[PDB]
Design a protein around this nucleic acid. Structure first.
Lengths: 424, 305, 333, 124, 333
DNA sequence: AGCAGCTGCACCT
DNA sequence: AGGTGCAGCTGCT
């Protein structure tokens, strides 16, 4: 019988909280009516409004706010295939959204306090031993309250869709089709959002950043998520959509799924003495991470040397392809290639990573770089690659520098065959 | 799901105002389900009358720009919207948000039909390319040819005819005109083995895509963990959460002659590769498979590595 | 029978984003290497000039509020200081099969709509609608504020069959006004080409270029974007103008709005001239909506009476329904 | 002269001491009550006393209007407001004390202006 | 009757950005290939010179603050040391149709507004406003600080019809003052041309060049830009100047402000110089507002009494309202 | 002699 | 740049 002051305190807080709009000329029955209706019959008013709401983990409103159809509460079975992430992974971590008209949402607060303080969150409808000494009512009123608070988890709708929903077609193996109607994963989005905001700012994530600024970092973790995007649902009033939506403040965050280069910048391979003859290497701004990994990647011992050697080989293999794509899109993108500054010296890069014949094509212009042996460029690229991979008596006197040279030799061995099938 | 008899190029498709969001969790490139649905629509509208079958698609992204903005030097991005017409009463309408992008891609298709034997190859390539320039791919229209340049006419490479050296030289020929951009493949096994490596804490797979699309730094007791490439979280099909219904049961259906099902997305891992570093060009092709007894409707790229 | 609960149509006549470049008149026939106009930034500072409140005027407070001005940074686009004209280029494709919906629930409504559109096309062609659609290509309505104040606007339209030019058209956009629709001997060939492409066979590709002699160093007006602003100490807006690859541009939907300015049959008056074809036909630069549902001259009730109850409207108002079937849209019960 | 203008003219000005000439001091003393007195005072206590006397049904409206007219001529310094709305063009500007001007903040009208005023406070 | 809730006008005088170059006097007839004036930067080291609050004006605090200097970097533009004249060139176009709005909700308001403007133009032309507009091109008021202390200023004005010159004007900008409005025989032809443009009966494009003889190596004054970050002591950039492609320039709105310095009809004085036309006509340098709303002489009172109640506000004050409509803006609610 | 519609108002995080 | 539900009203029946 100790659960009779909580609902009375909530009703009294709601009644005393309806005083910020004070009117002494239009309150002849407004103040008395608000005090009298919110005294004893407020439970009947909540029971009348409980029918609109529904407990839902897959909402249809995010796709469009005008669309009225059918929302589903279900946890799907786990797929057999490996390597798939979905909303089936949520177990105890799942939360439930509430859908319905906005005016009923405050009534859900009266349905949402049963999991706080007391343990009768599943004791509002059934198991009425906590619903009689704390309900303080008759038997018919208790039956009506148990029928009203149990309707949150009901089906509550006939199976329907809308013309503003998606409904795509999917092909069967050698047969007709299936109609798929995708819904919005509210609970999965809420779980990913709770996992993301804590990594962005919180207790340990900010304390490890303070330890980073204090330059005394211990073994611990903090993450960093670059170039997210923001998508907004609703507008100035985000409670129309879903209860969960309001918590995120009518919003949700999206992860970058972009291609390798989405911000093209013109390539400066013009007639420059410092940008033509010195541009035989290709120092781009996307090789800083690979250069920093190759710099601090040549110190590991033989207790874990296999993964470090494979990582160095993978970094070199990626660094070759970046230079190949930069030569294919930088000189090949711009439709002009004039005479280089100092053509007696700026002609190796202007011959290898240079375009075809143009309006200034002389007699010995289309018969020089296509007829000559295009195999010095591989050794020239190896001479640039030898500076990046540092060698000395510490590596050359040991047996790891020989394999570190043989890996670069096996990489640059295809540099004359894949980089020499254009002219010859 | 056989090895295709021929490959069909679509050389430089410029698409304006495609769909950028593509998933309830990502926002980059559009989903590959759009590309497989596009090639199935192209099959329905051409290949029934030309007696061929098209099943595979290879997505090489030459370039990509998005209609995004950067507010106040914050570390987020927003979407540039469009202005809708007014309401019936004539005040304004509520805003729904969608992202648009301008991309330029290339698509290589696989042909298995018997129509190759009786007709010339360039006629089939020309008719497919002519019919493809009149519909859209990702919600955005396909832009046609511009003046003052030489356009690219598509060719039909034959894969199941010839010697192996001539095969390898033709596959080295067709990779010359598709190197500027990169290709997109799927990585289910790599995500599975990376889940099984760090499985000593929590076996939830969704905490693995959210452990490869970040910059993790556990410093010294200043180093950056070696990324093995360009790992991106992608949508990887659908998964049902409702029983299959009857063609008249659900109201407001798109078609009243096809059963309907409610559905959630599935999230997997993918990678962007240079086109040189693959063995053959038919390893790239995307296919889709369904198990209607379960609710598994999934597109992926098989026979890769 | 009744209306299908899921009904949708696809946009025919879709343009692209137009691109803007600059140069000099009497060299416009070699305007393939003209450089693009670019978006720059400048800073403005103004004072209080808005209609202030009816009781907070206070002649000592306005003096104290005038000493603190406003301060902004805006995007701006100008012609160069040696260039004379402005070139705006885009492409258009007519898609054909303008009666069939993209989505329809019933099979009886679909065939009733099919035979209604069939009797319309059999009784009269697409000739009136194509003659009205070709006017907004012959004049240069698609450059909105770049047409006001110019002394010479010309339009070159060329038809593309293979990778070559099939036929060319040259107009004088200032002679053809923005109020009436008259038939010339050269506008009819373009109208017949648009009507043949709109009847279902494939697609028809045209390329439209407009040259406007505007001045020398004067400013031009591309589209500006709709964003939700930043909200911090920094500069929030740039009054952002739209760009494709460092080149000022006009949106696709704005040119599509300019081509759609067709209907003079709305019951208010033809004093505003033609408006754009919309259901409950409303103007964004007017604040209100003609073709209200209290009368019977909107899109939904006309189609409901023409397909279901079988009462055909006047032949003038028959063009409006076909016009916003060519426009497109999503309609459901 | 009503009251809303009285609390408006009381809150939008600075607090100044010795802002009156002695002729206006006896002019104000001739127009106030018998018991209370103001000497060597600041602005806000004077506004509180005349507001308390006008809340009482004892001081008339013309007399409080003369008091607030005299306070209107005397005080010449205003508080700089934090936000300013440009009304026809639908823009909201925020005052920046380092530039001594208003910089652009957001798009909105009177409702958004009242929202950021209730969120951040009206004056600097 | 009340004013419409949407009512917008556009500007009828369009100038461009005025770029500057430098050279020598008595060669200003061959000033087509003169090199431009470029912007450089330099270092400054200042001292404290502001008022102290006498709370921390101690004898040791001042000497402590003197030892810590403030170091800044500034932008600067000078003439070359072998050149003594500055040349400023821009173009201007006059549009016309200055009564019809750009947007309007009510159709009963805009018809009687066009009636009021039409009875103004029929009662008296645009001759007074065009005379006062041509005066501000004759005396080179658009050079703001480049005009003080100058030895000689000269102004050339051309009239462009095609890529040719239709008429030419030369003026001594120092003989024509900055105070009076006195009619010549050569200034009235320019006034007639500007009124012919503002009325609507012709296309008017002008180009204006101004030469100012200053001295060898002396400092010129372009438009100054906004710096977003707060000024920071010890090496921070402190000021930036406006530029176009490596050439100093003046903003278009600043040389547009120096054209509408017209009205002498404000009730304070008329012999203290003309100010710029504005609602609640205000100078931000003076920190005050002439034409207060406490009187009946601001724009929103005169316009709302001339249209809603038909109370003409005297011929002298009727040029103020029409000049405000030529200026542009959003009036109404 | 009520059906159907429609407008307008209030609630809510 | 809110959606949903209900009180009231009309109006020719």
């Amino acid at each position: 019988q100790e659960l009779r002051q909580f609902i009375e305190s909530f009703i009294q807080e709601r009644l005393q909280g309806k005083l910020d709009k004070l009117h002494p000329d239009e309150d002849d029955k407004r103040q008395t009516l608000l005090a009298t209706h919110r005294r004893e019959a407020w439970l009947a008013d909540a029971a009348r409004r409980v029918g609109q709401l529904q407990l839902v983990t897959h909402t249809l409103k995010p796709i469009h706010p005008d669309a009225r159809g059918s929302n589903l509460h279900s946890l799907p079975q786990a797929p057999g295939q490996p390597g798939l992430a979905g909303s089936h992974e949520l177990g105890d971590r799942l939360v439930s959204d509430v859908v319905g008209n906005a005016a009923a949402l405050d009534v859900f607060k009266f349905l949402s306090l049963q999991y706080q303080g007391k343990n009768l969150l599943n004791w509002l409808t059934e198991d009425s031993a906590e619903a009689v000494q704390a309900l303080s009512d008759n038997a018919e009123q208790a039956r009506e309250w148990r029928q009203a608070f149990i309707g949150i988890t009901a089906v509550k709708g006939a199976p329907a869709s809308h013309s503003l929903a998606k409904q795509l077609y999917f092909p069967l193996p050698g047969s007709g089709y299936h109609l798929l109607a995708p819904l919005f994963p509210t609970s999965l989005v809420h779980h990913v959002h709770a996992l993301l905001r804590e990594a962005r700012f919180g207790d340990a994530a900010k304390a490890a950043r303070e330890a980073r600024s204090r330059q005394e970092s211990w073994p611990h973790g903090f993450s960093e998520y670059p170039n997210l995007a923001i998508q907004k649902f609703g507008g100035t009033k985000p409670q129309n959509i879903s209860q969960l939506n309001s918590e995120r403040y009518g919003e949700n965050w999206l992860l970058p799924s972009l291609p390798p280069h989405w911000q093209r910048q013109d390539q400066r391979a013009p007639i420059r003495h410092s940008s033509v003859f010195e541009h035989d290497f290709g120092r781009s701004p996307e090789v800083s991470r690979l250069t920093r990994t190759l710099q601090r990647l040549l110190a590991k011992t033989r207790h874990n040397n296999f993964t470090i050697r494979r990582y160095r080989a993978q970094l070199v293999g990626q660094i070759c392809d970046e230079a190949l794509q930069y030569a294919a899109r930088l000189r090949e993108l711009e439709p002009g290639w004039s005479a280089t500054p100092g053509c007696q010296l700026h002609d190796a890069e202007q011959l290898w990573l240079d375009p075809l014949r143009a309006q200034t094509d002389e007699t010995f212009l289309q018969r020089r770089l296509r007829g000559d042996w295009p195999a010095e460029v591989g050794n020239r690229f190896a001479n640039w690659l030898n500076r990046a991979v540092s060698s000395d008596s510490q590596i050359l006197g040991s047996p790891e520098a020989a394999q570190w040279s043989q890996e670069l030799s096996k990489e640059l061995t295809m540099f004359k065959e894949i980089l020499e099938d254009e002219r010859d | 799901v056989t090895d295709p008899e021929a490959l069909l190029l679509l050389p430089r498709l410029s698409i304006q105002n495609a769909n950028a969001i593509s998933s309830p969790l990502t926002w980059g490139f559009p989903s590959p389900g759009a590309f497989t649905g596009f090639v199935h629509a192209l099959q329905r509208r051409v290949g029934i009358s030309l007696d061929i079958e098209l099943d595979g698609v290879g997505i090489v992204c030459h370039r990509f720009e998005a209609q995004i903005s950067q507010p106040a030097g914050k570390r987020t991005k927003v979407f540039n919207l469009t202005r809708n017409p007014l309401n019936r009463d004539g005040s304004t309408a509520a805003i729904v948000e969608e992202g648009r992008a301008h991309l330029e891609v290339s698509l290589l298709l696989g042909v298995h039909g018997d129509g190759l034997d009786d007709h010339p190859a360039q006629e089939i390539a020309r008719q497919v390319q002519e019919q493809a320039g009149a519909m859209r791919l990702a919600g955005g229209s396909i832009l046609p040819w511009c003046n003052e340049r030489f356009p690219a006419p598509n060719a039909e490479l034959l894969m199941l005819g010839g010697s192996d050296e001539q095969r390898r030289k033709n596959q080295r020929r067709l990779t010359r005109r598709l190197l500027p951009g990169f290709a997109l493949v799927s990585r289910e096994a790599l995500l599975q083995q990376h889940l099984e490596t760090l499985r000593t804490t929590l076996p939830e797979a969704t905490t693995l895509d959210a452990l490869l699309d970040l910059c993790r730094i556990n410093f010294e007791p200043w180093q950056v963990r070696d990324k093995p490439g360009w790992l991106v979280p992608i949508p990887a099909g659908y998964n049902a959460l409702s029983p299959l219904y009857l063609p008249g049961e659900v109201r407001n259906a798109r078609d009243r002659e096809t059963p309907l099902r409610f559905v959630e997305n599935l999230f997997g891992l993918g990678e962007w590769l240079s086109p040189h570093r693959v063995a053959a060009l038919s390893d790239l092709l995307w296919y889709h498979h369904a198990e209607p007894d379960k609710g598994l409707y999934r597109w992926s790229t098989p026979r890769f590595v | 029978l009744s209306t299908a609960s899921v009904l949708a149509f696809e946009r025919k006549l879709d343009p692209s984003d137009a691109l803007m470049s600059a140069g000099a008149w009497a060299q416009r026939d070699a305007s393939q290497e003209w450089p693009a106009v670019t978006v720059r930034e400048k800073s403005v500072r103004g004072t209080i000039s808005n209609r202030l409140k009816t009781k907070d005027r206070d002649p000592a407070k306005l003096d104290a509020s005038i000493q603190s001005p406003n301060l902004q940074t805006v995007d701006v686009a100008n012609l160069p200081s040696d260039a004379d004209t402005l070139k705006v280029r885009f492409t258009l494709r007519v898609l054909g099969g303008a009666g069939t919906p993209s989505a329809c629930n019933d099979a009886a409504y679909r065939d009733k709509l099919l035979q209604t559109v069939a009797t319309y096309v059999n009784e009269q062609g697409f000739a009136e609608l194509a003659r009205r659609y070709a006017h907004n290509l012959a004049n240069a309505r698609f450059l909105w504020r770049n047409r006001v104040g110019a002394e010479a606007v010309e339009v070159r339209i060329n038809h593309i069959r293979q990778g070559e030019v099939a036929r060319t058209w040259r107009f004088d956009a200032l002679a053809i006004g923005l109020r009436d629709f008259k038939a010339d001997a050269e506008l009819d060939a373009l109208a017949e080409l648009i009507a043949s492409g709109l009847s279902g066979s494939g697609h028809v590709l045209l390329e439209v270029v407009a040259f406007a002699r505007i001045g020398d160093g004067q400013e031009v007006f591309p589209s500006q974007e709709l964003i939700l602003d930043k909200g911090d100490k920094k500069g929030q807006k740039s009054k952002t103008l739209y760009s494709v690859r460092d080149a000022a541009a006009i949106h696709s939907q704005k040119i599509g709005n300019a081509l759609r300015t067709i209907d003079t049959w709305y019951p208010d008056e033809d004093g505003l001239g033609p408006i754009a074809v919309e259901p409950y036909g409303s103007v964004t630069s007017q604040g209100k909506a003609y073709r209200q549902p209290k009368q019977k001259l909107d899109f939904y009730t006309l189609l409901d009476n023409w397909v279901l109850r079988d009462e055909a409207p006047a032949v003038e108002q028959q063009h409006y329904v076909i016009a916003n079937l060519i426009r497109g849209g999503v309609f459901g019960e | 002269m009503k009251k809303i203008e009285m609390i408006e003219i009381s809150q939008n000005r600075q607090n100044l001491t010795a802002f009156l000439h002695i002729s206006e001091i006896k002019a104000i003393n001739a127009k106030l009550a018998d018991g209370v007195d103001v000497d060597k005072k600041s602005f806000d206590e004077i506004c509180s006393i005349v507001l308390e006397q006008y809340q009482a049904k004892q001081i008339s409206n013309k007399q409080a209007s003369e008091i607030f007219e005299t306070l209107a001529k005397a005080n010449k310094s205003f508080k700089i407001e934090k936000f300013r709305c440009s009304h026809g063009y639908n823009e909201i500007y925020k005052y920046s004390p380092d530039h001594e001007a208003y910089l652009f903040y957001c798009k909105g009208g009177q409702g958004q202006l009242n929202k950021l005023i209730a969120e951040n406070g009206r004056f600097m």
